[PDB]
Ligand binder design. Structure first.
Ligand code: CLA
Ligand code: CLA
Ligand code: CLA
Ligand code: CLA
Ligand code: CLA
Ligand code: CLA
Ligand SMILES: CC(C)=CCC/C(C)=C/CC/C(C)=C\CC/C(C)=C/CC/C(C)=C/CC/C(C)=C\CC/C(C)=C\CC/C(C)=C/CC/C(C)=C/CC1=CC(=O)C(C)=C(C)C1=O
Ligand SMILES: CCCCCCCCCCCCCCCC(=O)OC[C@H](CO[C@@H]1O[C@H](CS(=O)(=O)O)[C@@H](O)[C@H](O)[C@H]1O)OC(=O)CCCCCCCCCCCCCCC
Ligand SMILES: CC1=C(/C=C/C(C)=C/C=C/C(C)=C/C=C/C=C(C)/C=C/C=C(C)/C=C/C2=C(C)CCCC2(C)C)C(C)(C)CCC1
Ligand SMILES: CC1=C(/C=C/C(C)=C/C=C/C(C)=C/C=C/C=C(C)/C=C/C=C(C)/C=C/C2=C(C)CCCC2(C)C)C(C)(C)CCC1
Ligand SMILES: CC1=C(\C=C/C(C)=C/C=C/C(C)=C/C=C/C=C(C)/C=C/C=C(C)/C=C/C2=C(C)CCCC2(C)C)C(C)(C)CCC1
Lengths: 60, 134, 36, 60, 64, 504, 38, 502
């Protein structure tokens, strides 16, 4: 359907009233990028951890 | 054919080789035959997967703490055996002076710190020797 | 006391899997009766 | 059998539902009315043919 | 009705559905061939019962 | 709707998914034969084919793939014992491996016809209702089966492009695979000659060819087409299970009595080896060939193999075993260890005497010991008040000749009671009733379980033949009768019964 | 090559009292055969 | 309709069958307690209560009926060893039996309210909708529970019309049934004194009486009735589950640490008997009391009972046992046969030395042998290349004092390795690992399985308390929110959030 199942304007100021009002995510397309950023940029550090472990460059 | 994996050991530990009656030298005909002594599989450190050896290494049990000293496979003793083996000669060149020819080795099998009794294996191949002298 | 070691597998599938076959087929009729 | 030999017919004593029984009353009582109260104890009742006559005169 | 490449090679095989020979058909040609089968099965039943025992048969072991 | 026992009648009208409803059934049986034989290979013990052979391990399906020319099983062990092995694709797994993927490729084709129906093939051109011609199709089903038997007769059993079936000697010792010659005479009609089974499917296949070559060309008569109701799809369903339970009676028979298509090395002895003592006619023959030949008893009873002694045991005869004593024959005895010879019983006087007892339909035969003509000389006294033929007053000795425990006599009468019951079961055998948890009471072989499961099922397929044979003739009346019909049933309907075209 | 909808598949009508007959019949076969599986 | 996880919401409106839907649940739990304890009586082995006691047989429910005064088992084998006569009606076969017939009489009453609803009791007179008063009914539920605790305090635990609870000595030897006196002081607040548990339900019952006598007479305030949403059935359910979780934490606690309501003879030692060596403080005390009398240790270590030696075993401590090593403790060891004494280790010089090792959260402790102050004198060498403290170079002997195998020394160092590992598990014990098919690795007692199954379930009942506590406060919004509400959520708009008057 073309209409949304939920309102982003009520979900904004809930989380704006839970934490800082300035530190919520007002627009959903900036929200979903950070949803798609944080494990994705995270795990190829851990994948690059074992890949830099591979040449015996280890943890301290 | 029979789905075991016996660990064969081609050992040459102290052959003391007798020989038939009076030879000038080998004539690509004479028969060398005796035995060596064979070694083991567990050379005093080969643990099984519950760390079960004699020579150090956690006597006779780890995890069943109350059925502990009842099992039977923890006597892990080494041996200094003697058997039969034969080795022939067939080619025996003159200038580089290397002599070769067949062999027939009959050994004992593995005793994996003394579980099983040994099997018997007739291993037969060419010797590939090389001789020089004073 | 001796036992066959596998009858309790055998006589728990002998009783259930035709009865839950039969218990499947009664519920469907009830829905049909409802007309839903 | 009326001598000594306590023949088992109950499912707790190792016997199947084909082999189980109420295992009827003793030969030593004969045709005596042997209720639960003319027994000196219920262990004397159940060893000597007690619960067969309870499921005969009640059943008939 | 879904015409496939399979269906264009077997529609002449299943073309006729009830097409049936009149007159009498082949029932006397069926009966003279299959009364011999019942007496063929009468041979096989008592070869194996050993009741029409010929020579060099010996329905038994010592066979090959 | 419909009741639960008439569920499959949705497929009775349209033959679009009727191909699909066999094809998951065909995937279920092909996905049984691989799925069982791969389990059947998980418990084999190939270390001793002479002492516990493959029918001793309760093994239903690995004679049936084995008795056509397959042996190798990627383990260095072959039933034949023929060496220089290198299986490749046709080992035991490789037939059992293939039936998995075939049933997978059967199941993927089984789901195809369920979603796709009316593929321009199932309807007549006269109107669009789904209806298929059965007698023209019988000429093209059987012509393929006529080709395939003629392939199975000449091109598989005779060495032309294939290995032969299993064939042994009588008193089965050296049973291996070799291509058998099709013997065409009357000698191929006794089922113990394997030359008939090669001459079978050539001769039955060539008349299977000349049936289906004829059956495509002609049409059935209308005095049969309205009589046998040949347009109906259930009229193939009756009178094909008539040809299945007729066909299931013969392999209930020819497995049980025995044939060349049911040899001893992969089915066991066949229960009539005690009613004449068939194997006991041989080991007794060879020692008297060796006896007078120039060899004493003790030294003789040793060129007998233990395979001949293993077929002279009650515990390999397939009569014993019950319906619910479940499992292999090795749960009955354990693993056969050694022969320990043949008992010979002597008294204080000689007077040699023997035990030849325990027939098959007993369970507990009382031990008797008798002489050559039949007068009893010893028994086991059940009541020792008035004994006159007991072991102890007679003083019977045991000579145990040959085998593992050769030359060991027994003069103590407490130990003679053990070997007397062992002499009841032909020749004794050493066992180990602790490695498999074997209890001690008898089981039956794969020859026993086949004929139970192919004659009880053949009884059940007779009832479906009456039931489907009713519903084909009586299709119109099947949802009840027309209301009154009182003039058809009352006496005086000229003259033939049930006639409307008459005086009535 | 293209799907359709079936002009078929009548449903099933197992009654309430016919459930009781089938549930009892399995349970007498349960109490009959369970000794023989042991 | 509804999804599968909201099936029971049909009963949420009408309370006609809500009595009936507890009553088959009440028949299912009462028809478990008889149905389990009758199975639990089928495997007991009453031939030796001192060597394999009743918690050794993996027996969950027959401490709990047993620890209130019932020991007559019908076979004449009294639990306490003093079964004087025919017990009378109240033996385990009896109490177990009643719970069968009670659950049958619960189930026949459970089917009655399902077919009969609207029995003129579930509706208000103001309109005909089914609705029941909860706070007036809480005053009549709790007044019955206030009567029943005051019955349980004085009229059952104190000998007035009933036998007392189980009470033992410390280092549990002569634990039997006698009526305990309700001690009212501060001494009844430590849970090891059983005089508080009798003084419990008198004092908690009398304030349970004065609660429900008060709670019938008054009404809740409207600043609470709209706040706690007390007209709703769900809110009460949420409160009850939350309260229950709190109640399941304490018997997760007081079973595990131990109390007078959890004695040793029907629950085992309580896992803190190795972290201080509680039982090893006693058998060591009594032999040094015996040599203070002046006895030799060969014919001392014999007035110790084997019951004190059985509590000084690793294999009765409830720490060991795993999650999926399933079965009784007798599948771990077999049947306890005999003590075979206490090992005393001497070297070639004396230099006495001991083994006091294997704490609870290990599995394979390496065997060390040490002196009085802590310097190691012997061990088991894992690598015999550079050994300097091995058994063979030191030449350790074993003095096995007391018990079954008293006076039998061992000077061969192949056999000292067996008794050194036996000395790790306190005192050794003879077994038979063939009669029950016991494998040889440890299991845990009924004290171990209770606190696993009452703290994991109490975690799960915390989530239902959040879930039912949400749905009571948030009943109106539960099928989604009203559509826009953008003026309520945008800031600065007057004044305080959720106010419509700015
Ligand atoms: C070649 C085999 C064969 C085939 C294809 C059919 C086909 C049919 N039979 Mg039929 N039948 C057969 C053999 C066969 N029969 C035999 C051997 C008997 C005697 C026992 C019967 C007795 C019989 C009766 C009495 C009736 C049918 C009916 C039917 C029709 C519907 C079946 C249905 O919905 O049941 C669906 C079945 C079930 C939902 C479950 C039944 C429970 C069974 C016992 C489970 C089977 C166990 C196991 C899974 C199978 C393993 C055994 C197998 C290896 C043989 C269908 C045309 C019905 C009819 O008239 O319709 C036209 C009917 O009333 N059959
Ligand atoms: C006809 C086919 C056939 C044959 C002869 C056998 C025979 C055998 N199988 Mg086998 N099997 C079969 C089919 C067959 N199986 C199928 C289809 C499967 C897959 C489920 C298996 C799976 C299987 C396994 C997994 C194993 C065997 C094993 C064995 C052997 C041990 C004996 C035994 O279990 O008998 C036991 C027979 C019975 C107890 C008789 C059952 C009688 C039924 C229950 C009667 C049913 C009555 C019915 C409910 C009433 C109808 C109701 C009424 C209202 C109409 C024996 C050689 C064992 C073996 O040796 O393998 C190493 C083994 O481990 N089988
Ligand atoms: C109680 C037994 C019985 C009954 C009631 C039926 C009933 C029926 N069968 Mg049937 N049938 C049976 C047994 C039976 N069959 C047996 C044992 C077989 C062999 C497997 C068959 C094979 C069979 C086929 C192939 C067909 C039928 C058909 C039919 C139906 C039509 C009637 C018909 O033509 O009969 C058939 C008549 C007989 C079976 C009688 C046979 C009597 C023979 C000719 C006498 C031989 C005597 C001989 C001298 C002695 C030799 C034996 C000796 C060594 C002991 C009807 C439902 C037809 C059908 O399905 O309908 C569409 C059909 O096509 N039947
Ligand atoms: C005092 C206990 C108690 C009671 C009476 C209820 C009552 C209710 N809960 Mg609830 N709940 C509870 C505890 C309780 N809850 C706990 C402890 C949790 C946390 C795990 C939850 C989590 C929960 C959720 C998440 C939801 C409910 C819902 C519901 C309602 C409908 C239930 C339904 O249809 O499920 C029917 C259940 C099934 C058809 C099968 C579920 C499969 C389970 C796992 C099988 C249970 C195993 C076994 C049989 C039980 C033994 C364990 C037992 C000894 C504890 C109902 C008012 C639903 C709701 O909001 O409706 C208003 C809902 O969505 N509950
Ligand atoms: C909390 C109650 C309680 C307590 C503590 C115990 C404890 C015990 N029982 Mg017992 N039992 C109970 C309830 C309980 N039972 C119930 C309700 C029944 C009836 C079904 C039984 C029936 C029973 C029998 C028949 C026997 C015992 C026995 C035993 C003892 C052996 C140890 C054992 O089996 O643990 C084993 C424990 C486990 C293997 C843990 C199970 C963990 C489950 C499967 C986790 C579930 C996770 C779940 C599927 C995931 C959720 C999905 C997710 C998406 C949400 C032990 C003392 C035995 C004994 O000694 O008696 C003589 C015995 O024979 N019990
Ligand atoms: C993460 C924990 C958590 C959360 C989110 C909730 C949420 C809720 N509870 Mg709840 N509850 C909890 C834990 C929690 N509970 C615990 C642990 C208990 C004890 C078993 C309860 C007992 C309880 C009851 C009895 C009731 C609720 C109710 C409610 C609901 C209304 C809000 C309310 O009054 O809160 C209650 C407030 C608290 C639980 C906060 C307690 C904080 C205390 C007062 C501070 C004490 C600090 C102290 C100095 C330190 C002592 C401890 C020290 C020894 C370490 C709401 C759904 C009510 C309800 O069901 O709604 C209708 C209701 O009647 N709760
Ligand atoms: C003594 C008494 C009585 C005192 C009371 C009276 C009194 C005097 C009070 C004054 C005291 C007072 C006010 C405060 C003192 C206490 C104090 C300083 C407490 C602070 C403690 C502390 C460390 C707080 C910080 C921790 C905290 C709350 C948050 C951490 C924030 C952080 C770094 C990261 C959070 C992660 C993050 C950015 C999440 C957002 C990302 C995300 C995926 C959002 C999802 C999301 C966002 C949307 O935007 C919308 C739209 C939708 C759809 C949506 O999915
Ligand atoms: C069970 C037996 C069923 C009846 C057999 C049958 O179908 O007979 C049909 C024919 C008669 O058709 C004869 O031949 C004619 C055949 S036709 O018109 O050419 O089709 C027919 O018209 C004529 O009336 C009729 O006498 O039966 C016979 O007499 C021929 C069979 C002779 C050999 C018997 C073996
Ligand atoms: C997808 C696919 C696949 C797969 C396949 C498969 C895997 C299959 C399976 C198959 C199978 C898995 C088969 C089997 C089956 C089985 C069965 C089918 C059985 C049955 C049974 C029965 C029938 C029985 C009966 C009975 C009983 C119950 C008991 C006894 C008696 C009687 C007989 C009655 C592949 C990848 C390859 C390829 C692609 C496709
Ligand atoms: C009718 C009647 C009667 C009867 C009654 C009865 C008989 C009842 C029964 C009862 C019973 C019979 C009871 C029991 C029950 C049981 C139960 C109820 C169980 C349950 C279980 C559970 C719940 C479990 C769960 C689980 C699992 C699964 C495993 C482990 C874990 C858990 C826990 C999770 C009488 C005659 C008397 C009288 C009249 C009436
Ligand atoms: C294809 C398809 C189809 C059909 C489907 C169906 C419906 C199927 C069925 C299927 C079936 C119907 C199957 C069955 C199978 C069988 C089984 C699954 C069984 C198994 C069993 C067993 C194995 C048993 C038992 C046992 C045990 C386990 C233990 C004891 C021993 C014995 C062996 C007895 C259609 C076309 C529609 C379409 C879609 C797809």
């Amino acid at each position: 359907q073309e209409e949304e199942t939920y309102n982003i304007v009520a979900a904004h100021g809930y989380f704006g009233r839970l934490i800082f009002q300035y530190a919520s995510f007002n627009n959903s397309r900036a929200l979903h990028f950070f949803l798609g950023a944080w494990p994705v940029v995270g795990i190829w550090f851990a994948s690059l951890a074992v890949a830099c472990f591979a040449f015996n460059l280890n943890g301290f | 054919g029979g789905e075991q994996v016996p660990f064969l050991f081609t050992i040459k530990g102290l052959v003391a080789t007798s020989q038939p009656g009076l030879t000038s030298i080998n004539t690509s005909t004479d028969f060398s035959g005796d035995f060596n002594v064979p070694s083991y599989r567990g050379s005093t450190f080969l643990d099984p997967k519950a760390r079960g050896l004699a020579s150090g290494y956690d006597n006779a049990v780890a995890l069943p703490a109350t059925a502990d000293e009842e099992d039977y496979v923890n006597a892990n003793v080494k041996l200094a055996d003697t058997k039969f083996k034969a080795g022939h000669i067939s080619l025996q060149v003159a200038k580089v002076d290397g002599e070769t020819g067949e062999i027939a080795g009959i050994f004992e099998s593995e005793q994996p710190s003394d579980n099983d009794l040994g099997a018997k294996e007739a291993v037969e191949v060419k010797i590939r020797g090389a001789f020089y002298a004073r | 006391m001796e036992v066959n070691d596998l009858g309790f597998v055998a006589s728990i599938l002998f009783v259930l899997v035709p009865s839950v076959f039969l218990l499947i087929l009664y519920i469907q009729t009830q829905s049909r009766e409802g007309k839903e | 059998d009326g001598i000594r030999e306590p023949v088992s017919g109950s499912l707790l004593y190792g016997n199947n539902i084909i082999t189980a029984a109420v295992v009827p009353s003793s030969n030593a009582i004969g045709l005596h009315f042997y209720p639960i109260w003319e027994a000196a104890n219920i262990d004397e009742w159940l060893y000597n043919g007690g619960p067969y006559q309870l499921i005969v005169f009640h059943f008939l | 009705a879904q015409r496939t490449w399979l269906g264009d090679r077997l529609r002449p095989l299943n073309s006729e559905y009830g097409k049936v020979a009149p007159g009498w058909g082949t029932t006397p040609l069926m009966g003279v061939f299959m009364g011999l089968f019942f007496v063929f099965l009468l041979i096989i039943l008592q070869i194996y019962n050993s009741s029409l025992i010929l020579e060099n048969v010996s329905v038994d072991w010592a066979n090959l | 709707g419909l009741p639960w026992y008439r569920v499959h009648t949705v497929v009775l009208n349209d033959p679009g998914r009727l191909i699909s409803v066999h094809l998951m059934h065909t995937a279920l049986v092909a996905g049984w034969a691989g799925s069982m034989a791969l389990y059947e290979l998980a418990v084999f013990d190939p270390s001793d084919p002479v002492l516990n052979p493959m029918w001793r391990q309760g093994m239903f399906v690995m004679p049936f793939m084995a008795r056509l020319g397959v042996t190798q099983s990627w383990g260095g062990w072959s039933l034949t014992g023929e060496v220089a092995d290198n299986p490749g694709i046709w080992s035991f797994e490789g037939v059992a491996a293939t039936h998995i993927i075939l049933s997978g490729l059967l199941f993927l084709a089984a789901v195809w016809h369920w979603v796709y129906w009316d593929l321009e093939l199932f309807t007549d051109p006269r109107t669009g209702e789904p209806a298929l011609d059965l007698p023209k199709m019988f000429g093209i089903h059987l012509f393929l089966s006529g080709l395939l038997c003629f392939g199975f007769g000449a091109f598989h059993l005779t060495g032309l492009f294939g290995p032969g079936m299993w064939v042994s000697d009588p008193y089965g010792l050296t049973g291996s695979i070799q291509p058998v010659a099709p013997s065409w005479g009357p000698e191929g009609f006794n089922p113990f000659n394997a030359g008939g089974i090669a001459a079978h499917h050539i001769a039955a296949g060539i008349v299977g060819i000349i049936a289906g070559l004829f059956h495509l060309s002609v049409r059935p008569p209308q005095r049969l087409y309205k009589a046998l109701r040949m347009g109906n799809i259930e009229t193939v369903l009756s009178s094909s299970i008539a040809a299945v339970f007729f066909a299931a009676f013969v392999v209930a028979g020819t497995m049980w009595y025995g044939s060349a298509a049911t040899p001893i090395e992969l089915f066991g002895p066949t229960r009539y080896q005690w009613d004449q003592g068939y194997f006991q006619q041989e080991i007794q023959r060879r020692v008297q060939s060796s006896i007078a030949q120039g060899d004493s008893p003790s030294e003789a009873w040793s060129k007998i193999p233990e395979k001949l002694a293993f077929y002279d045991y009650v515990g390999n005869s397939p009569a014993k075993g019950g319906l619910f004593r479940v499992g292999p024959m090795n749960k009955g005895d354990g693993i056969a260890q050694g022969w320990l010879g043949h008992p010979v019983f002597t008294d204080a006087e000689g007077r040699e005497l023997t035990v030849r007892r325990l027939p098959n339909f007993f369970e507990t035969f009382p031990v008797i010991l008798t002489d050559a003509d039949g007068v009893i000389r010893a028994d086991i006294p059940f009541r020792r008040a008035e004994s006159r033929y007991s072991f102890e007053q007679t003083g019977v000795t045991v000579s145990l000749y040959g085998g593992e425990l050769n030359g060991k006599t027994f003069t103590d009468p407490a130990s003679v009671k053990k070997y007397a019951r062992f002499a009841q079961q032909g020749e004794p055998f050493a066992f180990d009733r602790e490695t498999l948890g074997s209890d001690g009471v008898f089981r039956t072989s794969t020859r026993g379980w086949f004929t139970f499961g192919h004659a009880c099922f053949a009884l059940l397929f007779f009832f479906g033949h009456i039931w489907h044979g009713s519903r084909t003739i009586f299709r119109d009346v099947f949802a009840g009768v027309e209301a009154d019909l009182e003039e058809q049933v009352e006496w005086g309907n000229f003259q033939k019964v049930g006639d409307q075209t008459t005086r009535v | 090559m293209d799907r359709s909808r079936n002009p078929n598949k009548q449903p099933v009508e197992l009654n309430r009292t016919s459930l009781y007959l089938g549930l009892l019949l399995i349970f007498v076969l349960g109490i009959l055969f369970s000794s023989y599986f042991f």
